[PDB]
């Protein structure tokens, strides 16, 4: 009961792409870990933006660049913690497979 | 744990405006009742629409007409029940004063 995210420990995969460790922690510690490539965060972001765009349009009807990537993903994730519209998002909850 | 809204029993106020009974029920019954004029629902609606418009624009940065009114308010309220982005809304929770 108090969410905290980190994105860390990038690691190359045998298939070539870099993978990140996404850590979700809950403290009054329960932690959930998944591995994600930057393209996953891109899809997530896109799904959030389109979900809220359409919510809106429905209401109104009636090579250290990967550090930049790691930080971007992490920031984006942190952004949702204290916005219940984003925090409670289904897309967010599916994002954590394992 | 299973939300249900109704808007009902319109009643004129000594000051002239019509007032509605908003009933929020929770069943596995816990019910919360508030009284609201149609202008309140208008403000609510406007706040939801603007909250999600700006969420979007932030993500992408990096005299039976009163029956029509009653129904409109009720429909609008029901709309949020199974959208966690709307259901968990702070504006929604403030809406229930008493």
Swiss-Prot record, chains A, B:
Bilayer-spanning residue ranges: none
Localization annotation: Cytoplasm; Membrane; Cytoplasmic vesicle membrane
UniProt modified residues of type Omega-N-methylarginine: 78
Organs and tissues of expression: Widely expressed.
Domain PX, chain residue ranges per copy: 1-98
Domain of life: Eukaryota
List of residues binding a 1,2-diacyl-sn-glycero-3-phospho-(1D-myo-inositol-3-phosphate): 37, 39, 69
Oligomer status and interactors: Homodimer. Interacts with SNX1, SNX2 and SNX4.
Similarity annotation: Belongs to the sorting nexin family.
The protein's role, per its UniProt record: May be involved in several stages of intracellular trafficking. Overexpression of SNX15 disrupts the normal trafficking of proteins from the plasma membrane to recycling endosomes or the TGN.
Entry domain remark: The PX domain mediates interaction with membranes enriched in phosphatidylinositol 3-phosphate.
Protein name according to UniProt: Sorting nexin-15
Native organism: Homo sapiens
Phylogenetic classification of the source organism: Eukaryota, Metazoa, Chordata, Craniata, Vertebrata
Gene: SNX15
């Amino acid at each position: 009961f108090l969410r905290h995210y980190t994105v860390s420990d990038p690691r190359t995969h045998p298939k070539g792409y870099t993978e990140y460790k996404v850590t979700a922690q809950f403290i009054s510690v329960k932690e959930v870990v998944v591995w994600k490539r930057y393209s996953d965060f891109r899809k997530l972001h896109g799904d959030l933006a389109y979900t809220h765009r359409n919510l809106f349009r429905r209401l109104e009807e009636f090579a250290s660049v990967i550090e930049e990537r790691r930080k971007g993903a992490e920031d984006l994730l942190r952004f949702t913690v204290h916005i219940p519209a984003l925090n409670n998002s289904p897309q967010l909850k599916e994002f954590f497979r394992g």
